[PDB]
Design a protein around this nucleic acid. Structure first.
Ligand SMILES: [Mg+2]
Ligand SMILES: [Mg+2]
Ligand SMILES: [Mg+2]
Ligand SMILES: [Mg+2]
Ligand SMILES: [Mg+2]
Ligand SMILES: [Mg+2]
Ligand SMILES: [Mg+2]
Ligand SMILES: [Mg+2]
Ligand SMILES: [Mg+2]
Ligand SMILES: [Mg+2]
Ligand SMILES: [Mg+2]
Ligand SMILES: [Mg+2]
Ligand SMILES: [Mg+2]
Ligand SMILES: [Mg+2]
Ligand SMILES: [Mg+2]
Ligand SMILES: [Mg+2]
Ligand SMILES: [Mg+2]
Ligand SMILES: [Mg+2]
Ligand SMILES: [Mg+2]
Ligand SMILES: [Mg+2]
Ligand SMILES: [Mg+2]
Ligand SMILES: [Mg+2]
Ligand SMILES: [Mg+2]
Ligand SMILES: [Mg+2]
Ligand SMILES: [Mg+2]
Ligand SMILES: [Mg+2]
Ligand SMILES: [Mg+2]
Ligand SMILES: [Mg+2]
Ligand SMILES: [Mg+2]
Ligand SMILES: [Mg+2]
Ligand SMILES: [Mg+2]
Ligand SMILES: [Mg+2]
Lengths: 121, 50, 67, 81
RNA sequence: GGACGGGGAACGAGCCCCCGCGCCCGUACCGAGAACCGACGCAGGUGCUCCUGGGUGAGAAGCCCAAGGCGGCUCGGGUGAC
RNA sequence: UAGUAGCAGCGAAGAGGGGUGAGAAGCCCCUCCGCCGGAAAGGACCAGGGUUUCCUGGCAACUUCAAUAGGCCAGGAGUUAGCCGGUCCUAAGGCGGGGCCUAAUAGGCACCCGCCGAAAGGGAAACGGGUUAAUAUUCCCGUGCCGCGGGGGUAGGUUCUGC
RNA sequence: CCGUGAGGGAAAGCUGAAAAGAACCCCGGAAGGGGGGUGAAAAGAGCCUGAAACCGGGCGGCUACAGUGGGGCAGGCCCGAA
RNA sequence: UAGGCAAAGCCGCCCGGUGGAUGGCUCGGCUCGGGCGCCGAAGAAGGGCGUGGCAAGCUGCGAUAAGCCCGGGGUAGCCGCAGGCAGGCUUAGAACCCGGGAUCCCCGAAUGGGGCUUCCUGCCGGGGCCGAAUAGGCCCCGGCGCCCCGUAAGGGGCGGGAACGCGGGGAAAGGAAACAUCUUAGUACCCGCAGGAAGGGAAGCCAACAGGGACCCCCUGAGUAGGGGCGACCGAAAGGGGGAUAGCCCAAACCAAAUCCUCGCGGGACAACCGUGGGGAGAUGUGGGGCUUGGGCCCGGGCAACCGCCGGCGGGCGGUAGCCGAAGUGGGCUGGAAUGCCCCGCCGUAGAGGGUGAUAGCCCCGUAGGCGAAACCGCCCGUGGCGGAGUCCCGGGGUCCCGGAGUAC
């Protein structure tokens, strides 16, 4: 459950050895001020189908849909944050979730609504 | 030997099954980090004590 | 889609036996292709094996429940 | 008890010329058990069973079917060919 | 295998015809001047352990030649001083 | 040191022509020349080795040189038994339980009981031909044998014994 | 992995923010080389930095009638931007 | 005469090749502190072999084989190390984590018997197959170890574990400037046997006429007394200060079967126990009584009697997953990219620490702080059920009986 130790070696070992259900917590991204008043929560784990605004990096200011989430890498792919390889294919830049802000929420999942009510309280 | 006991033969079978390098797709999957196997041996050089 | 443990429990023993026989035959055919180097659906052998394990698990539970 | 069929060049030649199917079975299976299993599963008659253990530790059985059943037809029916 | 004894049944053979069953493990290849041991594809050791045609000959000696194998005791060429 | 020593000595060695190939003294085919022939060499085979076997492909490394070769590398394949061996028996000997000994044991063993101990001793029964890239007394064809059990016939028996 | 065995036993970490892991053209039998690309940087998968010994090339000084290294003085050639 | 002018060779710098130092990094080590603490015939630990679509090793797993089922947590992704090619699984709730189950090859205490090959093989009982057969043969499943306890049914021991604990056997090297007594050392090591701790523990004590008051461990007494080729060297105890605190039973006197165990049936919180019947133990004494504030024995008085067995029900707390948790991603600059610089804000019970494209209180995880469990486990509290021969408290009387043997010596 992520160590309580203050030692950097144990903090990092917790991060790299975290099982999948803990790695989900690293997907949290801040909600936009508009969504914060509508939903009443400040953060949600990024989900495929959400729409995020990128706040840092080369694609800063680009808004797009999340197309894929990698729990192992703790990275997300966002429409628009792309480039082409030498063979002409379109590839996605892996963006850390702490660098994006969620501007539209995908709420078609009933299980996701339970998380919102828990944090709204 | 021509006349083998089965127990010895099955230990020889295990060594025969394990004597091979990692597949080429393993080399690709690990970015060339895994290229050798400790079970790789040559019948003339590394002797089993079977 | 794939047969869930709930649906397997509602089956009569005869249907479970017949399903088990089909899977073991399918596994024999698939392992033959694997030895020949080419498998039509490379992800299928794993699901057949776990399905067989599922049926055998429910079989043991149902016997124990009456025991 | 049957793990798979053998469909090599030698095995297919023995199917056509000698009415034999070649199978890999569990290493502890005996000729009696192999003959019973083949008859029960495939509804054929077994004339005799020859067995060997391969250098990779697997038991292989050359199973000769009686003179009313076709080894080639059985392999086709099973869809292993 | 035979004989010498004891007990039992009413059937019944070592002869002729006919029927059935025979599990399990080994089985490739080298077996050595490169597949064994000697750190080696090592002139050693293990195993020449067992077998071998014709001529000459006392000879399973040497020499020459079969059957059969080899030119892989895994550098090549030139020169023709010491 | 140094592009130096060694890659000689132990009684065989190559050559011509053709093919393959980017490339050939060296790989493949023929011809010529040689060595072994009671064998550093042909036939068989135990232990040991353990896939080195066979097929296809290959040449970064490996082979005292080269290589298109390979016991090397990659991919695939291959070992079929009532009668061949083990298995059975005991040998010299050994192990276990009991018992006796021991501070004690995983240490000892005269005793009792059991078992193990030979792929060269004893010991049931298979030979010839053909087949595969690679197995062959194992597969296939033909002709048999052994053990155990059964059916029929026969001799014989049915108080008593065959001639 | 070594020893029959009791036992004994190494070496070996690091692309990049992201594979964007090098398209395409020419040469080579091939490993590969040249051109041209990616990246802030080749950091090029033999991947951070990349010292010395050592070897190659360039440059400065010497070099076949003169016996070697170190120090001082005087001089020649060469460098002397910060 | 010197220069153009140069062989092989020498020195220095630059570039390149080789090499892998240095520097930075760190999911590794080490030391210290705290916790927690046994597993195995219900077949362990350890080992062999197998197991993935492409899979050699490691890791996991066991023919149901990187896995099967149920529940809780966790929601949208997943298919270990391990960044590839495929194909799938998953919103009918997966992956993942926690609890409980299932499966669990061969060898292994290994336990039918063997075992020169982790494999082979016997008998009995049941089942299947080949077969004309009910013969014969083959195969599958179960039982079959030794030594013991028990009337029997039944039950026990065996093997493992990093160190620690208890009993026994038991050196030398070295030191003494040689060396033998001695020391090293009751050490190394060996053999046996336990527990989560072990061992010790309740005065035939210590003291000195003043008094302590079971035991173990820590500090001291103390390198004191004492032992010793009185050499090297070895070495207490009582007492004092602390940690912690706890006291009882068997036998016997006296009574004499009033006793215990097991099974069937009825009752009884799934128990103890009660009623009844059978079996076993028991006069070579079960049981009652008794334990220095000695007891037995006799008389009287009193309940605050005393002593023991069961662990059901309710409640609480804790452990084994988790959930919530403040405050900038503000303007400009540099930059591939800011967490940096300049300017402006804000939180703080939170400025422990980590991550994020360079250095972040306010981007994210977290932190201060708060909450939480279907299931399993542990601790505490309240309540409940039951048994005994008054065994309990106080006084008097006793002068009779008991008070541990190859022991003390
Ligand atoms: Mg060798
Ligand atoms: Mg066989
Ligand atoms: Mg052969
Ligand atoms: Mg040689
Ligand atoms: Mg000839
Ligand atoms: Mg020469
Ligand atoms: Mg020379
Ligand atoms: Mg000669
Ligand atoms: Mg030659
Ligand atoms: Mg000759
Ligand atoms: Mg001769
Ligand atoms: Mg020979
Ligand atoms: Mg070959
Ligand atoms: Mg070949
Ligand atoms: Mg090979
Ligand atoms: Mg024997
Ligand atoms: Mg052959
Ligand atoms: Mg570098
Ligand atoms: Mg200057
Ligand atoms: Mg020069
Ligand atoms: Mg295990
Ligand atoms: Mg056994
Ligand atoms: Mg023990
Ligand atoms: Mg010392
Ligand atoms: Mg001394
Ligand atoms: Mg001395
Ligand atoms: Mg204690
Ligand atoms: Mg104790
Ligand atoms: Mg002492
Ligand atoms: Mg009594
Ligand atoms: Mg939170
Ligand atoms: Mg926060």
């Amino acid at each position: 459950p992520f160590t309580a130790s203050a030692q950097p070696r144990k903090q990092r070992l917790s991060l790299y050895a975290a099982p999948l259900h803990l790695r989900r917590k690293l997907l949290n991204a801040k909600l936009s001020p508009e969504l914060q008043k509508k939903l009443g929560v400040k953060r949600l784990p990024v989900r495929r189908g959400d729409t995020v605004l990128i706040m840092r990096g080369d694609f800063k200011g680009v808004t797009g849909k999340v197309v894929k989430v990698d729990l192992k890498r703790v990275r997300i792919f966002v429409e628009g944050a792309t480039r082409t390889n030498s063979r002409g294919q379109t590839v996605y830049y892996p963006i850390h979730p702490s660098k994006v802000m969620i501007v539209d929420v995908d709420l078609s999942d009933k299980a996701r609504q339970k998380l919102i009510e828990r944090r709204k309280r | 030997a021509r006349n083998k006991p089965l127990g010895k033969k099955l230990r020889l079978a295990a060594a025969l099954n394990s004597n091979r390098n990692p597949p080429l797709w393993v080399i690709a999957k690990t970015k060339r980090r895994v290229t050798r196997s400790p079970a790789r041996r040559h019948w003339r050089r590394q002797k089993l004590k079977a | 889609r794939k047969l869930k443990p709930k649906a397997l429990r509602e089956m009569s023993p005869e249907e479970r036996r017949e399903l088990l026989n089909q899977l073991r035959a399918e596994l024999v055919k698939l392992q033959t292709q694997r030895s020949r180097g080419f498998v039509e659906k490379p992800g299928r052998i794993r699901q057949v094996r776990r399905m067989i394990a599922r049926i055998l698990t429910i079989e043991r539970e149902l016997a124990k429940a009456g025991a | 008890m049957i793990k798979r069929f053998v469909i090599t060049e030698k095995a297919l030649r023995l199917a056509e010329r000698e009415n034999k199917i070649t199978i890999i079975v569990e290493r502890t299976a005996t000729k009696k058990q192999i003959a019973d299993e083949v008859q029960r599963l495939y509804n054929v008659k077994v004339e005799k069973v020859n067995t060997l253990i391969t250098p990779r530790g697997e038991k292989k059985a050359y199973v000769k079917l009686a003179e009313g059943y076709s080894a080639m037809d059985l392999l086709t029916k099973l869809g292993v060919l």
